[model samples]
Target chain A: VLYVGSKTKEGVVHGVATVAEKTKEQVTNVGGAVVTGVTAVAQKTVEGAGSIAAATGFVK
Target chain B: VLYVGSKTKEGVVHGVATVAEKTKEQVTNVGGAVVTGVTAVAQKTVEGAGSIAAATGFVK
Candidate 1:
């Protein structure tokens, strides 16, 4: 989810990206460029679960 | 090139980027999302030229 470095040449360019999404598609689609040809340095996804609290019927 | 600004509540985002490409199409696609209508704040491209250096053969 971040840009570390890049070549930035007129015609040819290279760069790195940090993906936050679980799938690489998001990163690839976002970073990949025909002119730039963005390369992936690394990617890490944190997976887990959470609970939601719901209210019961109100007391009479 | 960075997450300059974002309106998470409104699902809108704005940011600045230093594009390595010669066109804006690439940058627009990279940042824009359905849920978050990403906006391009600013962009700049540094132009110039250069030469290559190589080692010459040994002069006996």
Candidate 2:
């Protein structure tokens, strides 16, 4: 159960990272220069966290 | 691009909902009764937001 939950969370995190990347791209293209920067940072943070979560096999 | 962004955000919201649900289930199993309640509520909230996000096709 623990292992299953960890895998589930990891999958969720990866989904979030993908969404964050898409959002960042849209923000960049839509002329919200300031918001684009914010989204860029947010995208990286989410992606990094997703990688860490998957590697650690823990979610909480 | 806007449509793509909306879809992406919706996906992320769904991912969050999934994680929240798993967390709730784990809390229920782990003997953290009070925390389990919190997680249940959190799960509902995230799921609700996910539904709304996907239906509205907006994220920001």
Candidate 3:
């Protein structure tokens, strides 16, 4: 679920993005942090995206 | 403090817990992982439970 969120190399969490597109800007706005680890970060990001996607109903 | 180690959401931190009946591994065995925001952990584990509690007094 939270795996979609962005993260930093140091394992810090960043923001979330949409599945259709993954960009740096998307990850920074949702109150996520930057950490280390590329693969881990990406996994989290995708999960985060899915979470947000589900939230679409709340916004609508 | 560390407030009873156990977190997983999205924030930043590591470990430390003790006091009450909390059964956390002892002997250092350091190594923590988790995220998300929560209370800032407890402080002093019951004031050292009270002296042992203050070192129970030096044997040195």
Candidate 4:
């Protein structure tokens, strides 16, 4: 999710994630969508946004 | 977002993100908390999970 954000903002992108112990219903709602959105958004945003990772797709 | 998930599963963590084009109210609810939780979890999950970032704080 984080990487994705950076990736797109930079150039190209990819992201990975795992999560657990979310009690609040909002957790999943918020958390689940968060990572998902980040990955997709990051990849798309990549060309727009990098340092190597951010620049070269070495990021996230 | 992506970084945080990996960070914890692997060690210490931090994450970065920026997003737009949210139409669904679920977007904010879901997306808003996702990165926040990941970041917090990743850090706490750090000692529990890494190789460098996952191993160290080198990850998200």
List per-prediction Cα lDDT, in the order shown. 0.23, 0.18, 0.22, 0.26
Model 3: per-residue lDDT, tens digit, A1-60? 223333323324233221222222212212222221111221222211211111111110
By DockQ thresholds, what CAPRI class is model 1?
incorrect
Worst 10 residues of 4 chain A by lDDT: A50-59
Worst 10 residues of 1 chain B by lDDT: B46-55
Our model 1 lands, by Cα RMSD against the true structure, at 25.0
Per residue, candidate 2 scores C-alpha lDDT tens digits across A19-52 of 1222122111221112111111112122112111
- The alpha-carbon deviation from the true structure for residue B16 of candidate 2, after best TM-score superposition, in angstroms, is 17
Q: For model 2, what is the alpha-carbon lDDT of residue B36?
A: 15
**Residues B23-46, model 3: lDDT tens digits:** 332221111111221222211112
Off by over 4 Å in 4: A1-10, A26-40, A43-60, B1-60
User: Residue-wise lDDT of candidate 2 within B1-60, one digit each (tens)?
Assistant: 212111222222233222222211211111111211111111211211311101111223
Please provide, for model 1 over A1-60, each residue's C-alpha lDDT reduced to its tens digit, 9 standing for 90 to 100: 553343222222123222222222222233212222322111112122111111222222
Per-residue CA lDDT of model 1 for B6-59, tens digit only, reads: 321221112223333222222332321221221121112212212111222222
List the candidate 1 regions with Cα displacement exceeding 4 Å.
Answer: A1-8, A23-60, B1-60
User: Evaluated on chain B only, what are the TM-scores of all the candidate structures, in order?
Assistant: 0.17, 0.14, 0.15, 0.21
DockQ for the candidates, in order: 0.03, 0.03, 0.02, 0.08
Residue-level lDDT for B9 in candidate 3: 41
Model 2 clash pairs are none
